[PDB]
Short mmCIF file of C-alpha atoms (C1' of nucleotides) and ligand atoms in Angstrom, two decimals:
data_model
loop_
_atom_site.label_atom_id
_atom_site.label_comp_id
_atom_site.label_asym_id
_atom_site.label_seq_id
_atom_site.Cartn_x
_atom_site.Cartn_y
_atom_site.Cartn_z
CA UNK X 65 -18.64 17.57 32.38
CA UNK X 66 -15.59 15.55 33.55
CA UNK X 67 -15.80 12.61 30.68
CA UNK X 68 -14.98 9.28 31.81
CA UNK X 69 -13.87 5.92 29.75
CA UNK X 70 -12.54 2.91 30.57
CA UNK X 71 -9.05 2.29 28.94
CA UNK X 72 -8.66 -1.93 30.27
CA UNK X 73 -10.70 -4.12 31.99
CA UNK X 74 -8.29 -6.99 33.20
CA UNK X 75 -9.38 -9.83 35.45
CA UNK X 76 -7.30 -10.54 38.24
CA UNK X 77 -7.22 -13.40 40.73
CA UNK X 78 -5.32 -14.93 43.76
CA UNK X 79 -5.52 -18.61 45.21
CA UNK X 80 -6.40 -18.94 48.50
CA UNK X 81 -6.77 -22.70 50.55
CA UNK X 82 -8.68 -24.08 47.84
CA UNK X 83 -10.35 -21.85 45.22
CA UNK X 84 -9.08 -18.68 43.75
CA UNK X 85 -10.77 -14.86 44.39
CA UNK X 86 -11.38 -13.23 41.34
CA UNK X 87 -11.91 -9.36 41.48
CA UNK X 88 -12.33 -7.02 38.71
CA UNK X 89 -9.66 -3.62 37.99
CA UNK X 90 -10.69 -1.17 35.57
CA UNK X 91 -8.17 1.64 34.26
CA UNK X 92 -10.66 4.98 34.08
CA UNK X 93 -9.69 8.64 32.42
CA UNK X 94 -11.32 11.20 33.39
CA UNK X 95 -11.05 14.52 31.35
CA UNK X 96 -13.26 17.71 31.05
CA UNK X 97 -11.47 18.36 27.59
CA UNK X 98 -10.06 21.85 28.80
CA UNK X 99 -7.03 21.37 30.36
CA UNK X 100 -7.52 18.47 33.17
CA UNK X 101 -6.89 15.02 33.14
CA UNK X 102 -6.12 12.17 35.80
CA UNK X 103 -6.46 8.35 35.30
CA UNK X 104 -7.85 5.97 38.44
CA UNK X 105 -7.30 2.43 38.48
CA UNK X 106 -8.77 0.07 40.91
CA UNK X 107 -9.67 -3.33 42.31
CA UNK X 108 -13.48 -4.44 43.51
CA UNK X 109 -15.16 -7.87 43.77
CA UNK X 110 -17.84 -6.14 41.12
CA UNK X 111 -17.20 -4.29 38.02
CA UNK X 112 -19.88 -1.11 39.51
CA UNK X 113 -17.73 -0.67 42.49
CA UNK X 114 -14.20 -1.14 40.98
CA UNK X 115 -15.45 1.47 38.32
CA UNK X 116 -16.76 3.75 41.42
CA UNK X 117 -13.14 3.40 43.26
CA UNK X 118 -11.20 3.95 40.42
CA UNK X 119 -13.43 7.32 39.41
CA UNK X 120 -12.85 8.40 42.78
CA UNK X 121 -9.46 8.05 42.17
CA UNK X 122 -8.93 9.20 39.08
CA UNK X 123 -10.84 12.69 40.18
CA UNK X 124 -8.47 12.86 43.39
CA UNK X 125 -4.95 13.36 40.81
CA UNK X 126 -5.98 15.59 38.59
CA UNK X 127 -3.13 17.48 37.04
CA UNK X 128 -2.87 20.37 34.64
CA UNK X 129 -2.82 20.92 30.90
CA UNK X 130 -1.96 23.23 28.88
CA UNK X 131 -2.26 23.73 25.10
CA UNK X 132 -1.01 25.46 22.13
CA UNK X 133 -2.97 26.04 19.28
CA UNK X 134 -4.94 22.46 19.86
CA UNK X 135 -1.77 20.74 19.79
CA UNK X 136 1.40 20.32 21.62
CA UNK X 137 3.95 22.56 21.60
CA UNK X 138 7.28 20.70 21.33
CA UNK X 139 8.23 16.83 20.94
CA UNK X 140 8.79 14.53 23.34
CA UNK X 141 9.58 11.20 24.49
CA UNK X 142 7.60 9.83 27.76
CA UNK X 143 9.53 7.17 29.73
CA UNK X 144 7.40 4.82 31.98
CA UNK X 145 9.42 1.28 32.62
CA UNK X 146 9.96 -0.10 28.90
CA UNK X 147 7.03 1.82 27.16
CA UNK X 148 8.38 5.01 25.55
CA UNK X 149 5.83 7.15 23.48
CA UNK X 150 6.43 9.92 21.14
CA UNK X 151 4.83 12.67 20.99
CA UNK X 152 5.04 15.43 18.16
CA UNK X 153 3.85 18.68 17.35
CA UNK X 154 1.03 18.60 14.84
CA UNK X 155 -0.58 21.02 11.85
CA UNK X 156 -4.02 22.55 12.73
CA UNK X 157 -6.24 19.18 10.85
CA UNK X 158 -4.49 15.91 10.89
CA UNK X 159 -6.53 15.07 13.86
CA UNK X 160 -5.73 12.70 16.52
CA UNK X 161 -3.49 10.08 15.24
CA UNK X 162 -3.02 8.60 18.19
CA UNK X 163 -4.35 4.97 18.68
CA UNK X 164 -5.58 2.82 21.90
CA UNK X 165 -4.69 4.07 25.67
CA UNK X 166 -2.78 7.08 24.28
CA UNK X 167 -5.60 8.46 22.20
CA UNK X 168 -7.62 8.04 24.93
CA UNK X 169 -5.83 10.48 27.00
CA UNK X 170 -4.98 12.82 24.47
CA UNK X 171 -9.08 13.25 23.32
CA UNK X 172 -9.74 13.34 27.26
CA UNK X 173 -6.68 16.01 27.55
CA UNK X 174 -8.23 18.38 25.05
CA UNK X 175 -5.53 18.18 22.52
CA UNK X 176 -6.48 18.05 19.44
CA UNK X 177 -4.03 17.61 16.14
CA UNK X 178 -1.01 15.20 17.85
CA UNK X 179 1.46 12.98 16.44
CA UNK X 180 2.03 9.98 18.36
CA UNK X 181 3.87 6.13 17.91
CA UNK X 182 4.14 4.12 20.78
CA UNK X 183 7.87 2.73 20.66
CA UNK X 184 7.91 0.29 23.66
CA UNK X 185 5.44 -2.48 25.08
CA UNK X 186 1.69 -2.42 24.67
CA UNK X 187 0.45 -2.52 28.44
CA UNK X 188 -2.23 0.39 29.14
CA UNK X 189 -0.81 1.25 32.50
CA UNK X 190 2.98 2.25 31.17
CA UNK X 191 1.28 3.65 27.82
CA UNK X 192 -0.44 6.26 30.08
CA UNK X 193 2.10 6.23 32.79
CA UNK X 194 4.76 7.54 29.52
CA UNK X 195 1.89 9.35 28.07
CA UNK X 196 1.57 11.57 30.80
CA UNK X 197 5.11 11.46 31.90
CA UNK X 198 6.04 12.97 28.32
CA UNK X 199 2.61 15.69 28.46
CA UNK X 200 4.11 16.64 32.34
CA UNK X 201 7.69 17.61 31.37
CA UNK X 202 6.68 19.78 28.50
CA UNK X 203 8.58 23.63 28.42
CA UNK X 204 6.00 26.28 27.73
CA UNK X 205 7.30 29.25 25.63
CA UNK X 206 6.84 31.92 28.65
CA UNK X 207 8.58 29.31 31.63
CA UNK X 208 11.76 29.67 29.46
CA UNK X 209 11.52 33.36 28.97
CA UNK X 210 11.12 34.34 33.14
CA UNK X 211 14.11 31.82 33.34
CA UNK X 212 16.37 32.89 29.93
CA UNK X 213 15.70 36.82 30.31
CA UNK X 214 14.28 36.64 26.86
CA UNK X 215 11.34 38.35 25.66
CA UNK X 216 8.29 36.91 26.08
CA UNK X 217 9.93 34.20 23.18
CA UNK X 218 10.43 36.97 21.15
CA UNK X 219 13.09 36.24 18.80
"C1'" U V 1 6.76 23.56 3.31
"C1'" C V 2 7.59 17.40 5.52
"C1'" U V 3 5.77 14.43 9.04
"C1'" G V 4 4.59 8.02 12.26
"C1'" A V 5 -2.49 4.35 15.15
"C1'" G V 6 -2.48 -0.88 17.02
"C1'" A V 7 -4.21 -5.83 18.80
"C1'" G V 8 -4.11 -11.29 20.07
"C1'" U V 9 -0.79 -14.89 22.25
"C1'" U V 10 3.80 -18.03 27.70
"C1'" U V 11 1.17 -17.23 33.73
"C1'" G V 12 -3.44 -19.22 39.20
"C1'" A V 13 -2.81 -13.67 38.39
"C1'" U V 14 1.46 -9.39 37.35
"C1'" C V 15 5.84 -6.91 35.08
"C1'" C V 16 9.82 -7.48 31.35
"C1'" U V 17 12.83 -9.96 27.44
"C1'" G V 18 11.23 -12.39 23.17
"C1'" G V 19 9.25 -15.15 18.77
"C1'" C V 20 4.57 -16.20 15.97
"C1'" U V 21 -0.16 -14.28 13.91
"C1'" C V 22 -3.62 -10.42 12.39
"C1'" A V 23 -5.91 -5.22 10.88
"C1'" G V 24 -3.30 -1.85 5.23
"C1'" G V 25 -1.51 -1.66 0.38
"C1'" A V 26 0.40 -4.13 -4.23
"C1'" U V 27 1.01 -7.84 -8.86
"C1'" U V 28 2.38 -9.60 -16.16
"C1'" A V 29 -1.18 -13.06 -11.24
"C1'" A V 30 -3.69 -18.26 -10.95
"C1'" C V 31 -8.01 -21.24 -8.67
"C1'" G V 32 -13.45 -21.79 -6.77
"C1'" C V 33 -18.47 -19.46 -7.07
"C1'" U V 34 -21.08 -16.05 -9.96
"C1'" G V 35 -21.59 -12.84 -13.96
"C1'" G V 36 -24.84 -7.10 -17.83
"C1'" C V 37 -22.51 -3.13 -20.35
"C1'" G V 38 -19.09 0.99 -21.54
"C1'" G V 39 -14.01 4.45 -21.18
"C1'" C V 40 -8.65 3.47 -20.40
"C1'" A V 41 -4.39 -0.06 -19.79
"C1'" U V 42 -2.29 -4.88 -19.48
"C1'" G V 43 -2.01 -10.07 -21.38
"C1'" C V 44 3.89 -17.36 -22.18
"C1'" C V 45 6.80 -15.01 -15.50
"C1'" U V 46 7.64 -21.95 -17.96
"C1'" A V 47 10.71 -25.07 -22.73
"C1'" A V 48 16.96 -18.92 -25.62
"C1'" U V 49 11.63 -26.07 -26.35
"C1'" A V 50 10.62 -28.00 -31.68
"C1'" C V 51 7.85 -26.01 -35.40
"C1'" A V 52 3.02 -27.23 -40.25
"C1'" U V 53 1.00 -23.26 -43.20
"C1'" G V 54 0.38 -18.05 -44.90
"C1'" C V 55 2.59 -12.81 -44.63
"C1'" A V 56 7.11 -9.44 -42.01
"C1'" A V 57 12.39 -4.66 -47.50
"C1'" G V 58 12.20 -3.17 -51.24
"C1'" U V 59 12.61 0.84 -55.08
"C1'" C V 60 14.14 3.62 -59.64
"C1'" G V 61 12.61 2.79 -67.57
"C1'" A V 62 14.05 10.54 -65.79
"C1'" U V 63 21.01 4.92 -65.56
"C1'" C V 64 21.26 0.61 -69.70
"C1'" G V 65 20.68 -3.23 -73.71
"C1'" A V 66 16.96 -6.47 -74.84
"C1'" A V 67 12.29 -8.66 -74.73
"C1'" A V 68 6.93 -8.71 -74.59
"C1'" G V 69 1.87 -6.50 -75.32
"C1'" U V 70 -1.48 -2.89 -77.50
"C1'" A V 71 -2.40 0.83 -81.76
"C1'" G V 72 -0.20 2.32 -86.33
"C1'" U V 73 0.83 1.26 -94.13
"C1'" A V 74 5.45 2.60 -92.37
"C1'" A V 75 8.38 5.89 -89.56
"C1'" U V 76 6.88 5.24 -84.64
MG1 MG G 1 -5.06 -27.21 52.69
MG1 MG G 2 -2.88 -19.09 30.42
MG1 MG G 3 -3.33 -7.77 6.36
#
RNA sequence: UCUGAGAGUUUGAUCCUGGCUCAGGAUUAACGCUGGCGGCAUGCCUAAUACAUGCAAGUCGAUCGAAAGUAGUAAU
């Protein structure tokens, strides 16, 4: 039950001897709301076959997520180009207060309570790009431990 | 135990810098249309401009002389 929504549907074009070929991209995210999540964007003379291409895409990167209590574990600051989004650790109810191409992701993610401002420019493609850049570098509380001879975050 | 939502807009199309505008609240508010009632609260932001008229700090005869009025033949 790999969800799928479009995020932008831009209209692109280049001139050619007279005339100018117009051709449809979509931005897809696809997310079964357990853990996986990829994004697919693509170009098509159609809007059924961009959306096709860019689902095909989107389900051939699909990376790993994982969660803590619905939310995410530690804050962070995704860096795509000049879009920067913050992420922060949420209580178990606020919801997601996320808003455009970042809430999409997060709801496709599975997250659910999240904190999030977006701090740089408004294009979909770097919001996601940072989005997912910040979600990728996160520390789980067991990576550190194997590394820092803890225990198990124990104390 | 706190805790943050974005979008439109330069270009044939794209990215960035960057300004403008909007989605939310708020007031001692005014205007247009309309208009039934009740519980709370507010009500010259301007000319510290000029003001009719009527009210807004008096009280004690158990401090004191006198006066006045009513009863009383008078004293009282
Ligand atoms: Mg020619
Ligand atoms: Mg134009
Ligand atoms: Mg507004």
């Amino acid at each position: 039950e790999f969800e799928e929504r479009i995020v932008k549907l831009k209209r692109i074009s280049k001139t050619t001897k007279g005339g100018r070929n117009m051709r449809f991209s979509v931005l897809v995210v696809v997310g079964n709301r357990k853990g996986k999540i990829g994004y697919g964007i693509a170009k098509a003379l159609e809007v059924p076959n961009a959306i096709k291409k860019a689902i095909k895409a989107a389900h051939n990167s699909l990376h790993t997520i994982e969660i803590h209590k619905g939310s995410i574990y530690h804050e962070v600051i995704g860096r795509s180009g000049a879009s920067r989004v913050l992420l922060k650790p949420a209580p178990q109810g606020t919801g997601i207060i996320a808003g455009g191409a970042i809430r999409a992701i997060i709801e496709l993610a599975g997250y659910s309570d999240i904190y999030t401002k977006n701090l740089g420019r408004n294009t979909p493609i770097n919001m996601i790009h940072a989005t997912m850049d910040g979600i990728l570098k996160q520390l789980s509380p067991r990576r550190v431990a194997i590394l820092r001879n803890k225990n198990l975050n124990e104390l």
